[PDB]
Write a protein that binds this ligand. Structure first.
Ligand code: HEM
Ligand code: HEM
Ligand code: HEM
Ligand code: HEM
Lengths: 146, 141, 146, 141
């Protein structure tokens, strides 16, 4: 959504240190662990029995890098998240049939993962900036639902 | 916690729904599908048009579970045991959706129970639906 | 809000048959009975100890008329609820300190009241239309919170 | 329902917090006020600036009450009885804000427990804060 000029820079800065592939697998992995019902969409992924299994699942990691790579690209379009994610929105609603609530939940996990990996650097203002980002991305992906 | 007054209010109003429980369940589903399109993500295998055989079928199932819950308001977790199992381990309907259907079941009842839907009964019914939802979501994590 | 042409008609048609004063008091009263915590804002109103006390309270009935009156007035501006409730939004935040969730709770109640008052005339498609309206009014009223 | 491992995980993580709990409470509050401004509607009597005496003090209170809950994890309803009474009868904070503060407590812990905050502990801590939220709001109606 509307971040301030400084918030947009805080986001941009922090993200320059983010290994998208790793944070992607980590974030999606924790989503399946903390909110196990999200696993409903990934039966084909194989072993998702324990946290160590989910986190170590190669399909989970690979899907996580895909999901976060798309999220990453969208950061270059902060002022038009609705437009940049429109196609993905239709796909998640029409083909994938994914409840938008899942996007909000992954957003919660992503923030926890950033806080975790960055520590003190992920300050309250930096968090506020990313809250606007994950909320905007979730609203943008949910927008074309019908 | 459903007070004795809540249980009396609930049983009276549900008692009034009676033979229409099936028709009401199907109507609440439709109200939900229309007002909150996201909920349809759980029914891609359903024909969701008005008067659908699947909607009618599922609406009767939903209503029957509610009838059972009301007849056992004093021990719902036990009465809805296989049901909380089904939603937690198979369906995996995100918890936020339960409030949407509760809202629409309330609306449906309001539209059908002119005399019965007093503010108090309205309050008791809201609590009851939240209880059923709490139970149905009890084994997710 | 983003209603379709027919939805805009259904809203206006139904609303014309609405007695704002009667429905405003009913809706506000039911808000206080159904979600008792909302009473926090109306200490000056006096007796709010029981459903009958609340529903028969003159101040609740008066405030209901005022609130739904502003809601009614807003229905003539579905094209820009933001600008319409901008001042009110700033007032509920800075002066009254009202949590925007209260606006959504009032919306749920109103829909129930419309359902109760109109019976089957409040069809599923009419409700969906009113859902976007109450959602949009709540959103407009929340827009100026900071 | 918090499992045995959940309670083991919670106690272990919160123990690590230790003497920093109050400081973390204030940080959690600051993160919540900033990321979710609507929660500030409940503190119009507070100086909400970074480092304010009021947020510092309230952060300690919230942390201690969480330490109290951790100490009585098998019976939180009774242990937090006076607090659930307070929130339901006086403060009357709408139930939705509890999830907001829980999110920021969880984020504050992640920010301070590089080694401790594993996926499993993440899950248990989230469940824990949700339950504490549930009891503090259990007497709302
Ligand atoms: C930040 C939000 C998300 C982004 C940007 C995102 C991105 C994507 C992308 C780029 C694809 C591949 C689609 C294609 O181009 O062919 C995908 C697939 C998919 N996404 Fe999302 N996604 C997000 C969150 C989620 C969440 C939270 C869920 C559900 C827990 C989800 C479930 C799926 C599923 C089921 C697939 C299909 C995987 C398969 O091939 O089996 N996504 N997503
Ligand atoms: C709040 C009250 C609810 C009740 C009492 C309830 C009850 C039921 C019942 C009785 C069944 C049929 C079980 C059987 O045939 O063995 C069922 C299935 C199902 N429910 Fe729930 N449910 C509730 C909420 C939800 C919600 C909120 C959704 C999603 C918006 C949902 C989605 C489903 C789905 C996906 C099915 C299976 C549909 C099919 O394939 O036929 N349920 N539910
Ligand atoms: C559609 C929703 C609402 C609208 C459009 C609305 C409208 C209004 C208006 C017109 C005023 C008077 C402003 C003035 O001229 O000074 C007002 C005051 C007030 N509103 Fe709202 N309001 C809404 C919902 C609510 C809700 C749900 C709450 C909280 C439960 C709330 C709490 C108040 C309070 C406490 C006052 C102060 C005046 C008094 O009652 O003494 N409002 N509102
Ligand atoms: C994990 C959840 C929470 C815990 C453990 C908690 C704990 C407490 C405690 C220990 C007190 C002090 C009681 C006393 O002085 O006797 C209190 C006060 C307060 N809490 Fe809660 N609370 C929680 C959530 C919330 C939420 C979500 C809000 C709203 C955003 C809230 C708003 C307040 C307010 C307004 C006060 C009074 C502050 C003052 O004037 O000093 N609390 N809470």
């Amino acid at each position: 959504v509307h971040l301030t000029p400084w918030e947009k820079s805080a986001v941009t800065a922090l993200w320059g240190k983010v290994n998208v592939d790793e944070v992607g697998g980590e974030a999606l992995g924790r989503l399946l662990v903390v909110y196990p019902w999200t696993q409903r969409f990934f039966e084909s992924f194989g072993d998702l029995s324990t946290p160590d299994a989910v986190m170590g699942n190669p399909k989970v990691k690979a899907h996580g890098k895909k999901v976060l790579g798309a999220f990453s690209d969208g950061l270059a379009h902060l002022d038009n998240l609705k437009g940049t994610f429109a196609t993905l929105s239709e796909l998640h609603c029409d083909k994938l049939h994914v409840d938008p609530e899942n996007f909000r939940l992954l957003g919660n996990v992503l923030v926890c993962v950033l806080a975790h990996h960055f520590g003190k650097e992920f300050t309250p203002p930096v968090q506020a900036a990313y809250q606007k980002v994950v909320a905007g991305v979730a609203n943008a992906l949910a927008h074309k639902y019908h | 916690v459903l007070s004795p007054a809540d249980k009396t209010n609930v049983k009276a109003a549900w008692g009034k729904v009676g033979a229409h429980a099936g028709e009401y369940g199907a109507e609440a589903l439709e109200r939900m599908f229309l007002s909150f399109p996201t909920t349809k993500t759980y029914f891609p295998h359903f024909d969701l048009s008005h008067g659908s055989a699947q909607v009618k079928g599922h609406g009767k199932k939903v209503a029957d579970a509610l009838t059972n819950a009301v007849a056992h308001v004093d021990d719902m977790p036990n009465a809805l045991s296989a049901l909380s199992d089904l939603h937690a381990h198979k369906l995996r309907v995100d918890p936020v959706n339960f409030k949407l259907l509760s809202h629409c079941l309330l609306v449906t009842l309001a539209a059908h129970l002119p005399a019965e839907f007093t503010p108090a009964v309205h309050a008791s019914l809201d609590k009851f639906l939240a209880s059923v939802s709490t139970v149905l979501t009890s084994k997710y994590r």
